[PDB]
């Protein structure tokens, strides 16, 4: 009976606490910063060969090997510097939705509507990629997956709960619960000590890999969260939802700092990515193109309209030399 | 300008040929999406047809292959995984007629049918509506008045009229009728004919696609 009143009181208390820190807006601080100007990129290489919609793609720790995932049931390993296919992993479930690339380059994860995360080992004595481990136990479609080490992987499912799986064992080590909607995105910090998850509740929850509890819950959106990307520094992150507006949260400020939205954009944000310096925010939209925003002084710096279908995923290399953009048109283009 | 990259290029071209072969092989297989308000209407046709989450049933009829994808176990948000079946050949929606007096069930079935019919991705996808549980419905219509489900049903409690009224109510959900085709049909546990019905419904869409590609429409 009194628990709901106490919850409302705590909500108002945290609201007032966050408001007390709202001294000045990011624009008031960045007024002294010069504009970035027009940013025009060139499609250096187009990676064609898929026979279905490309839904997910991830970059490796070498800036040359990138994994792709489409609805055709194939996982292609592309060599960025030569557009050559290195490996072609056949999938048992063509309904894939996410893909990951291990930091060392020896394992790649894949999941989707099968409620199973399949790990494939690339470094084997044979000449064929074999299944390492099949992690099962989720009651929802796998939305995103990212590796922490060679024996641990964080996976978000469409059951309001995330899970940390240990590969060599195959069981769950930490179940992160607290969401009220289907978890759609995951982004791990550079230190791999804490990761943020965006779900279908207009809220992004931060989680630690060891304890297993929610530290901060950032709100402000008005629709389902579809993309999230951690800031290179590791103390902030951007989140894009179907409301046609990206929002930057800071773990230290504990609230929003600035939003990215234009009156002409009315569609959702499917993917978001940051540059090496964090000054350029890449945003993939359903208008068959991607846009670049200034992280400090919100302004659209350029457009990467080079696809015929929705831009599924975006990826910026660790060195920030090029940007791989995938779309449902079966093409993955490398802009630079 | 290459020392050993020729071997890498050969491997790449070979796996490209392999992917092309797999694509042209999987391009001649019909894809069906099974939907329904309850397992009562879905599992009956799943087991009636020939030979975890999604369930893939692959069956061949008159040298034509069909892969039916059942996503009933996926209790997550449908809006986040329904877009994957945009390129589906047809949507087989099963509704149990013997469910109006087993509370509201038919209301949820109609809601789901309207949601999947007027969706952004299924603007032109064909829908085959299988009204199962014919015997149980004919048996219970005598006892339970149909007015419980349709308060505006001013008719007789016969089957040949209540079934027609239900079919009309289900077909009146498509706000756009000129672009979509609804294949309504009644079935039971011992029909064995639904295979030919689905085959005809798929051949119709195949003829439509051919007319599109041949330079017509």
């Amino acid at each position: 009976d009194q628990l709901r009143q106490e919850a409302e009181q705590l909500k108002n208390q945290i609201r007032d606490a966050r408001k007390a820190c709202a001294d000045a807006t990011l624009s008031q601080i960045t007024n002294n910063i010069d504009p970035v100007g027009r940013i025009q990129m060139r499609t250096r290489r187009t990676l064609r060969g898929h026979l279905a919609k490309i839904y997910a793609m991830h970059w490796g720790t070498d800036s040359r090997l990138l994994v792709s995932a489409s609805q055709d049931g194939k996982l292609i390993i592309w060599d960025s510097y030569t557009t050559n296919k290195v490996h072609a992993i056949p999938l048992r479930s063509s309904w894939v939705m996410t893909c990951a690339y291990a930091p060392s380059g020896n394992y790649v994860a894949c999941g989707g509507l099968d409620n199973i995360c399949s790990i494939y080992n690339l470094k084997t004595r044979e000449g064929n990629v074999r299944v390492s481990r099949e992690l099962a136990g989720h009651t929802g479609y796998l939305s995103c997956c990212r590796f922490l080490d060679d024996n641990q992987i964080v996976t978000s499912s469409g059951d309001t709960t995330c899970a940390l799986w240990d590969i060599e064992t195959g069981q769950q080590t930490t179940t992160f619960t607290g969401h009220t909607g289907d978890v759609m995105s995951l982004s791990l910090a550079p230190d791999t000590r804490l990761f943020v998850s965006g779900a279908c509740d207009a809220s992004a929850k931060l989680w630690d890999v060891r304890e297993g509890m929610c530290r901060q819950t950032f709100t402000g959106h008005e629709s389902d969260i579809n993309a999230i990307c951690f800031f290179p520094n590791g103390n902030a992150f951007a989140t894009g939802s179907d409301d046609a507006t990206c929002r930057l949260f800071d773990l230290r400020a504990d609230q929003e700092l600035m939003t990215y939205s234009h009156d002409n954009i009315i569609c959702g944000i499917t993917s978001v990515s940051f540059s090496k310096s964090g000054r350029l925010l890449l945003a993939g939209y359903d208008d068959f193109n991607c846009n670049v925003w200034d992280a400090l002084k919100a302004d659209r710096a350029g457009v990467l309209a080079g696809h015929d279908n929705r831009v599924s995923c975006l990826g910026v290399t660790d060195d920030g030399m090029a940007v791989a953009t995938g779309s449902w048109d079966s093409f993955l283009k490398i802009w630079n | 300008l290459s020392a050993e990259d020729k071997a890498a290029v050969e491997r790449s071209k070979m796996i490209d040929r392999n992917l092309r072969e797999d694509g042209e092989k999987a391009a001649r297989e019909v894809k069906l999406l099974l939907l329904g308000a309850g397992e009562s209407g879905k599992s009956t046709i799943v087991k009636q047809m020939k030979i975890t989450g999604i369930v893939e049933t692959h069956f061949t009829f008159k040298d034509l292959h069909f892969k039916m994808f059942d996503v009933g176990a996926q209790r997550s948000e449908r809006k986040k995984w329904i877009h994957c079946f945009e390129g589906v050949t047809a949507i087989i929606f099963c509704v149990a007629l013997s469910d109006y007096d087993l509370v509201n069930r038919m209301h949820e079935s109609m809601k789901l049918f309207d949601s999947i019919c007027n969706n952004k991705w299924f603007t032109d996808t064909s829908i085959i509506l299988f009204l199962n549980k014919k015997d149980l419905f004919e048996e219970k219509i005598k006892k339970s008045p149909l007015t419980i489900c349709y308060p505006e049903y001013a008719g007789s409690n016969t089957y040949e009229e209540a079934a027609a009224y239900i079919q009309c109510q289900f077909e009146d959900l498509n706000k756009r009728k000129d672009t979509k085709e609804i294949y309504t049909h009644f079935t039971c546990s011992t029909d064995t004919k639904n295979v030919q019905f689905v085959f005809d419904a798929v051949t119709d869409v195949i003829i439509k696609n051919n007319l599109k590609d041949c330079g017509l429409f």
Partner: single-chain antibody
Framework: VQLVESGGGLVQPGGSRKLSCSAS????????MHWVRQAPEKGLEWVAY????????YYADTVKGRFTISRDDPKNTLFLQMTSLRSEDTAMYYC??????????????WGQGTTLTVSAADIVMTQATSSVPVTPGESVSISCRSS???????????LYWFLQRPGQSPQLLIY???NLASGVPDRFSGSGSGTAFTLTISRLEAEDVGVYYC?????????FGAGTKLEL
């Protein structure tokens, strides 16, 4: 993995002979195959090669025309037909496996080999060092001088160090001089610039006793080294 060679023995000069290399324990269809001969008390030498799926075949100009290499993926067997055998073809033929892609390690596994006795422009790999007795527990340095600059435009220099133990088949010690093969201890380092290369062994062990071969993989006319024998 396993590669068994058959068809060896005493062959008359000028006769025909078919050698069969049976493979097992891997995707034979997705691995290129090489033939590397080794005459009695002499260095290695490449003979012929087939790529994955028999898409590109290569032969050595020294024995071009007389050797016919073919593959059988259904049965996973590499056939080598030889006609007009001369008094120089007397040697032990090794059936080597390889694979080519970004980060690959070619020449990983070498077959046991088959002995055959017959009764009766290229990049020269100058291996000045022939034999050097070294005591255990000390560092060893094996030099390799090449004729042509193996440093390709892309950057990755193609040069392979192999080690052959007495009475055993050679194995891939180092590939590209900067990446160790799966199964080699962390005691062999490579350092190469232009045409000079050096293999450094920190701690010598009994298993390291053997002949070292420096084989360049810049042009398909592969030429092996002379050999560097060590002792325990």
């Amino acid at each position: 993995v396993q590669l068994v060679e058959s068809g060896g023995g005493l062959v008359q000069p000028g006769g025909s002979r078919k050698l069969s290399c049976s493979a097992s324990g891997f995707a034979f269809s997705s691995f290129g195959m090489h033939w590397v001969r080794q005459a009695p008390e002499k260095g290695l030498e490449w003979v012929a090669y087939i790529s994955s799926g028999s898409g590109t075949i290569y032969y050595a100009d020294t024995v071009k025309g007389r050797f016919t290499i073919s593959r059988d993926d259904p049965k996973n067997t590499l056939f080598l037909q030889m006609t007009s055998l001369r008094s120089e073809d007397t040697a032990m033929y090794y059936c080597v496996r390889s694979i080519y892609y970004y980060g690959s390690s070619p020449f990983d596994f070498w077959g046991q080999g088959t002995t055959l006795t017959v009764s009766a422009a290229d990049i020269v790999m100058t291996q000045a060092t022939s034999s050097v007795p070294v005591t255990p527990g000390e560092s060893v340095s094996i030099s390799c001088r090449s004729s042509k600059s193996l440093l390709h435009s892309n950057g990755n220099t193609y040069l392979y160090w192999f080690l052959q133990r007495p009475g055993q088949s050679p194995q891939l010690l180092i590939y590209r001089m900067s990446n160790l093969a799966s199964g080699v201890p962390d005691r062999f380092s490579g350092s190469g610039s232009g045409t000079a290369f050096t293999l450094t062994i920190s701690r010598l062990e009994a298993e390291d006793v053997g002949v070292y071969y420096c084989m360049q993989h810049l042009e398909y006319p592969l030429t092996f080294g002379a050999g560097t024998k060590l002792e325990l």
